[PDB]
Amino acid sequence: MLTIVQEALTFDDVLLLPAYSTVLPKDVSLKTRLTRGIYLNIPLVSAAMDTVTESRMAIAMAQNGGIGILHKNMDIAAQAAEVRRVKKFEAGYPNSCKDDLGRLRVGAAVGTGADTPSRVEALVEAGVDVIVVDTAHGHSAGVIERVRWVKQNFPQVQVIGGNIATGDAALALLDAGADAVKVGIGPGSICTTRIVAGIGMPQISAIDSVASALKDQIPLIADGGIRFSGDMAKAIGAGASTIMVGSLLAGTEEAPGEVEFFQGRYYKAYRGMGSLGAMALVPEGIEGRVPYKGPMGNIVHQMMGGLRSSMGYTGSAVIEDLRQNAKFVKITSAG
Amino acid sequence: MLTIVQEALTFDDVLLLPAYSTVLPKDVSLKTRLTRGIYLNIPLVSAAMDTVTESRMAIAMAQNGGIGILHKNMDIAAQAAEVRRVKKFEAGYPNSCKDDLGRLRVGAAVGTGADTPSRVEALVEAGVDVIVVDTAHGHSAGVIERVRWVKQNFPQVQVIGGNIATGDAALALLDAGADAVKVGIGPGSICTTRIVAGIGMPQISAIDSVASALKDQIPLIADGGIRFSGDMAKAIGAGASTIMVGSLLAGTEEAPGEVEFFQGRYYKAYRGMGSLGAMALVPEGIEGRVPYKGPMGNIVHQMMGGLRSSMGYTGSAVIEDLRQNAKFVKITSAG
Amino acid sequence: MLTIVQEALTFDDVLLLPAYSTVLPKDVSLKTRLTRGIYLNIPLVSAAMDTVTESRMAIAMAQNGGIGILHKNMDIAAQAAEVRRVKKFEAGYPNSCKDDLGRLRVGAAVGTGADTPSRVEALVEAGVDVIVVDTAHGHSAGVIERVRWVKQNFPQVQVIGGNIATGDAALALLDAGADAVKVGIGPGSICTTRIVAGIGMPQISAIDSVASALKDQIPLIADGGIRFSGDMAKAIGAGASTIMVGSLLAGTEEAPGEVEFFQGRYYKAYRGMGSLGAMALVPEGIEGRVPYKGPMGNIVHQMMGGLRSSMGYTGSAVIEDLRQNAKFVKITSAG
């Protein structure tokens, strides 16, 4: 007999309801926690992608109150040099996300392969704030044990495990010692996992499954499928503490890559980390072009401003009020 | 755990069912109440928008049996002059909606800002029939107290509060002393609140939630998302006493703005009050062009004719029969 | 509170299930009943529309085993002349649908207006087999009393009442003396009733509601929304005894109207009876062009062959097996 666990929901399936409010959007607090030890000034995290985050994006992310996760599609020395570049950065930004030493915060992605022990050690030595054990399947023994290894061998660094879509996976990573979990199997804009493997979990239900199991022991990063500022609000309302974006920050001035002149117009490359180009396993991501967006600051302010509006509508003065008091309605295909 | 209050319905999710009928559409009464003290001859209200209602539209609305709500995107003196222009209007219209003095009825929108006490006083002095405390979030303390203030300081004028989408919001505005509530968070044709804030309530469920809580103590204006005369029928069947329209009356002769010649065709501007242009908070509305529709009288007659048809099908001799006896079916994406 | 009677289904919402079968499509019987007194050799009826059925179509319909319903958009004498043209027709067709006198069967539509008593009398005198009291709202006192009048004053003729969409309406027409009921409020291809009045009932649920109330006391004609032969099979499986088609027979050689040369291609006019053109109440139908289809015989054979296939799949040797033993599955938007 067929095991249908639930009818799973995505961002477009739901709407947040307005509630009694004494807070104006301009006055809400966007401060949240990335991990149990790291706090951010905005709930935004830039994706660990070779077309989204390198030192330039990580600096801009940290200056705006968030954090950048440096991609792992570079050799250990190149990646350690990128961590140092952010940690040693000095400006000529009051909401800057900084460590105890007043340096800009940064994260770096690691895999589970042979190079991981050397990669983790080089990144910790360079002063990385958080190690992200970055995979397509966080509910594997390789990820769970690598998370345990990072925590036991480098307790001075925060560790994130992903990607997950269920509460069982969250509990496994919590028991291993993760300081946060990254949620998202199938919601990515460049994701073909659903087509290739027939695997996935609609993001609102993934956030819910994970947040319900964790019971706020560790925060969760809602990773993938964010298209509008409304999706960020819905993700936080569903239980997320932070939001990871790829697409929205791709195309910006601070993102890696040069601007290309295609059909008169200006673009930047955007590709999945499991795409043919990025891998050089069957590909699980697509390669494409995104329009040139200019400085990332504008996109970030547009997105945060929409989140402030939502918190104004829901009567959420702080991120934690949205996370605890959000009420939703399920909408149909017509809505 | 995720709080899904209900599966919320919009106009396209439902159809009214035909019932035993002894009334022909030509003989149905379209008389209804705008507020607990103001009655209309047709359940139509023109939107408080700088591209929909100024004195010209308000006069045409009142002559046709409805009412116009003058927009607040003008200074106190300009708005008071517009109220007087409607109140002093004399023709060279048997269904005219008039006050005790035989003058055409008019409404005016007010905000919650510093200018509101002076604005209310100037509008009441000019002879305004109804003050509309017109905001994006009526369930805010600011709107509730402004509603309370208008009622206590100017009992001689009727007051509406909004916009709302829940029964709790309705009860809070009823307790403050509102004479009617305006329903609509997200259904507007030019609305981007759902995209920007991820906030909203499908209109049939919004009307239902509000009407069920009010228990006919005060009427509700179903504001936004009306595209056809069938939506009006469905809105009244769901519990609305009146319907507010922006889109349908935009592009008409009586609406503000000059006709523009674009690619042969004739157009008029139509924009949200929370759009970039209208504000000059992140924008929550779009700016656009609507085709030129000629005299508003033609659109009004087409809309009321369709509503008369629906009342004929449901055996509704008066507006109150449709509100109390309407039976619906939920339809799927295929329907 | 909102009264949602049910989630109503249309043709596209369901699929018939294959069952154990000892019958090949070539051997199935398509014989059914139009009214409790009139039997057809095929469950097909041509619509009472000025672009679908006049004497030419009614002759071709009767020769193929079905029946034509002559439209009422012509004067009493013109309509009576048309009935005679079919009653006096002699060929130079073994499945012909004929009366006791061996003459081809025909029906004629009547309204409820002042001319109805004279129209009914002229049609009965010309040898009409069935009077169809054709309207948009069968559940109106006007139709129930006109149906009762036709039965009491002309018991020698069969009478159909409609259009209806509910069981309550069917019982009212049954008590009035109708020999059959016509089902369809909103499914028509040229119907704008759902848009104009917000009134309607998805056809599978309309057939079901009516058939369940009638308990086979009188047959029902499933009228409107038939696009494919599978829709017919679905309609019969849901409880229909016959199917009425407009658009499928529009554009055929036999249908009224001349062929028009438009952008190389050949077309015929097809319009709703409640469209602007047909009326000359707000219009509830659209006017259009349908491609030239050639002799109607081909369309009829393609449609009947599909129903034979379906009956082969369901193990239905006779029409009554499909009506009694059909099992369905509800499908989603993806299906």
Added chain:
Amino acid sequence: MLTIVQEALTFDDVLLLPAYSTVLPKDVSLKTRLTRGIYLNIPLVSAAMDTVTESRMAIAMAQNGGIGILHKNMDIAAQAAEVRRVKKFEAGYPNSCKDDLGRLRVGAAVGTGADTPSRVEALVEAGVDVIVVDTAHGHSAGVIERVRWVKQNFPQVQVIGGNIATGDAALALLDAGADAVKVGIGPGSICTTRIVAGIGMPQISAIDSVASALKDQIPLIADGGIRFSGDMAKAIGAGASTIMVGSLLAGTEEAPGEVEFFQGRYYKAYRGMGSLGAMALVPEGIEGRVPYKGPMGNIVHQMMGGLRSSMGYTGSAVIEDLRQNAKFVKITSAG
């Protein structure tokens, strides 16, 4: 051997060149002659079409300084009543085009059929200023003979002959006694003559051929294919004294027909006089809808405004300067 008379040009093939100018657009004179005896204040004439000109359009045309040509698709009495309606019209318009008696000027179309002698007599008696012998082929002996008959029998009325496209045709009508010639075989927006008969003459070359042969003995009306104000200027520069428009004035308030609601948008019918609908010979015109344009006055002012600019660019103080001193360039498909 193939006789190619010339490479013939349409409006889009040419552009007028700017010249030394001392007269501003606001100060130019748009006064011109319709016939050798009739002068207009603007070079605009409304088409003799049942979807363009009846008394309402003819009055509005004359008030704006132009003239209307009443269509012949009505009985002699109906047409004579339309002439009188214009001649007897009194306002509650300084550029009004009036006769010696101060009455608004009007024209009426006639054919070559049996009713023509009675038609001409009734129109002359009704006070028509100009008889237009209105056909698809003015170079036919029938039209030349009817033009001669009107001039010899009714010298007190002005007479126009057409439609023509060559200098030979112009000279034949000039010898027949025509007071003006109407130019246009194939340029019409609803014209299918080029497809049906393979007959036609690109409008700039038609105007040129005719103007060059006439040597200003009688003026020419450039009839058909005017889409913009630029077309008008090019036609006058090529030799036209006036311009006849159908589609530009179709869909205006004053044009015959009611406004129809179709796909939310408002329209009016526009059809060729040789279309199936207008005739009820193979049809040589199409039937369609044009968007509702509102008052004709706006269209007329936009057109004259553009012709004023062209005259300002060419240094044409009067219409005759444009006619005599215009210099063109031939442009390619790329231009």
Added chain:
Amino acid sequence: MLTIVQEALTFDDVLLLPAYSTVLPKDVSLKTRLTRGIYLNIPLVSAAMDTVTESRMAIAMAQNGGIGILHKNMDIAAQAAEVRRVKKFEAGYPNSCKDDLGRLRVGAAVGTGADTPSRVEALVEAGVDVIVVDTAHGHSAGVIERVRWVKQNFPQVQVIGGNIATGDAALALLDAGADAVKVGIGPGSICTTRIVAGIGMPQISAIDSVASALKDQIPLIADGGIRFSGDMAKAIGAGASTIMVGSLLAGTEEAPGEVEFFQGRYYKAYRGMGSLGAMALVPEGIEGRVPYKGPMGNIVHQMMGGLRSSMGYTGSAVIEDLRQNAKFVKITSAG
């Protein structure tokens, strides 16, 4: 150095000019000559294609005043049976094209291959009026020689040679003893000769080149690229005596093939004789579907109707007037 013989023109490059006229379209004569010995009542010939002409089409063609050319994509006995079927046909058509014996006229196509001598003999014995030596290249030695053989061995039959596009080719076929010459290299709707071989001649220039060389010694059939009745007028004006059509008669009831139901609509197959399907050399034709057009008689009457109109415009009382006196204008891409 590059040899550009001329700038060659197609139908769309030219328009016929109106001229002085004393003839009405209804009174014009459409009588012409197919060959030096065979006269037709209408200048229309149906194409020798397996989707256009078999005995059914050839009978309908001859009854309408034209002639059918039976395709050669059948064995000698099958083709001879088709000739006899037409010759022996007796009706229950005053413009019928008949021989001296009062039998319907017919033509048959032959190739240059081994079976040609036996094929010619069987067709002549069956009473064929004209042998058509049907090829892609009439200027080939094989065709000129087969034409010579048919004339010397069977002087009792008329012989047509083709296809050609130049005057040199016409003179070679005239010296061979051809009674007519078929013109058309590249104009066909299903032709890919221009793409495959880069060979071709725009049809107006092909007709002109051929007619100018022949000096009326033998007539020419303008074969291919006729889309409208205007093309026919242009082809005759350019020097053609008759017109051969494939696409226009494909999809008619009389054309070979069954009607196919595809995406609701009704179609018939239409394919080039040099297409993959027809051959079973690289293919030089495409295979497709054409809409069902109904009886060919309607298409023929609409086509001849438009030709009568053109003759009325050009003052052509007979086909020879249009051939000898036609004057054209070259039009641009804008026209």
